[PDB]
Design a protein around this ligand. Structure first.
Ligand SMILES: *[C@@H]1O[C@H](CO)[C@@H](O)[C@H](O)[C@H]1NC(C)=O
Ligand SMILES: *[C@@H]1O[C@H](CO)[C@@H](O)[C@H](O)[C@H]1NC(C)=O
Lengths: 57, 50, 7
């Protein structure tokens, strides 16, 4: 939604461009658009959803 | 200078004009063909029109 | 939230 997806190899994170500030990748700091086939150089990682544990509680 | 993949640089140029960056990645081949064709037309313009 | 609120 803002910034860049980045990885240290072991993890995936998102940060704004102008200062490193790794955050978990979520339904809040991302938006969907379409199926994966179209995007050049796309990757697989689990996008988290903050509502999920609350529905589980 | 910070290296960045060129497609992602174009994505942040697109957010700079309010076009949402998914519009680039969903059209990247089309945009590359347009850009390469447009540079080609400059060579014909300069070659024909001193 | 409307379709998710089965819980
Ligand atoms: C990225 O570049 C490497 C070589 O540096 C190449 O093996 C790979 O296929 C490329 N991937 C894409 C999506 O361009
Ligand atoms: C991403 O996950 C899907 C489903 O598990 C799989 O078909 C696909 O091959 C994976 N991507 C890559 C780059 O292998």
């Amino acid at each position: 939604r803002e910034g860049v997806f980045v990885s240290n190899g072991t993890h995936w994170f998102v940060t704004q461009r102008n200062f490193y500030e790794p955050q978990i990748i979520t339904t809040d700091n991302t938006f969907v658009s379409g199926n994966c086939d179209v995007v050049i150089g796309i990757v697989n990682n689990t996008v988290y959803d903050p509502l999920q544990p609350e529905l589980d509680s | 200078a910070l290296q960045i993949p060129f497609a992602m640089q174009m994505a942040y140029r697109f957010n700079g004009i309010g076009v949402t960056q998914n519009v680039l990645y969903e059209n990247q081949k089309l945009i590359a063909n347009q850009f390469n064709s447009a540079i080609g037309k400059i060579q014909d313009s300069l070659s024909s029109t001193a």
